Amino acid sequence: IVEGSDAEIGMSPWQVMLFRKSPQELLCGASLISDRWVLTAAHCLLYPPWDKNFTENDLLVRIGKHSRTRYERNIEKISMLEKIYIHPRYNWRENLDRDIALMKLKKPVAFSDYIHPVCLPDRETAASLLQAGYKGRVTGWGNLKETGQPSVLQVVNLPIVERPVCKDSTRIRITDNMFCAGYKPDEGKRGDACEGDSGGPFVMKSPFNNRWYQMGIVSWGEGCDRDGKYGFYTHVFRLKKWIQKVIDQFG
């Protein structure tokens, strides 16, 4: 996260770190959506142009974390993966359309002060909140600058951007399964996700019911925090029928 701040303890108890076993390193962010299911970006797991194709045994999920590099004894919990499910129409060839994946954990994780699921949006909450100018919150342990790494989880709040502005900021074909967020050059304030934040959540706190909803997944960007560029996020609600199909079928 560029131009964010240190998270408060327990601020994002749904945040998940995807952790490579060997070499031991941060692969991506992710989020906890139930005691057995974790949501992330497909490109965190499968990206053939970079020879990336992780299997379940390659990775661990670390939940309840705050420190990036510490083993947070008595606080974090580490889970093994039972199965990865990538959206069948994830477009790794072109523009990362439908950049979404689920991971089922081998065992349920115990909830705590530090570990708690985020809600997924209904059609109504999405319609109400996914509006240009409305701000969400992005969290992660990724890079602090485009070109180092944080001691603890970082957080930044960023406004959703009008679709024509998103489209006019890039040569990439933008789809309805994406949205973009960030400040405009004339808006002064700054901030973006960056490498290593991929797969983590873009959340909004509903003013109707007090609950946090995950509206987006950190998907892609051209550099990080560049003037006139925006971060792009997977539109979770648009892909929720797939999410539900997977959870209904596989538990």
Binding site: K21, Q24, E25, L60, T69, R70, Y71, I78, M80
Partner: peptide, 10 residues
């Protein structure tokens, strides 16, 4: 990164 308990890598 600090080493994690071996139980998680088996």
């Amino acid at each position: 990164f600090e080493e994690i308990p071996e139980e998680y890598l088996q």
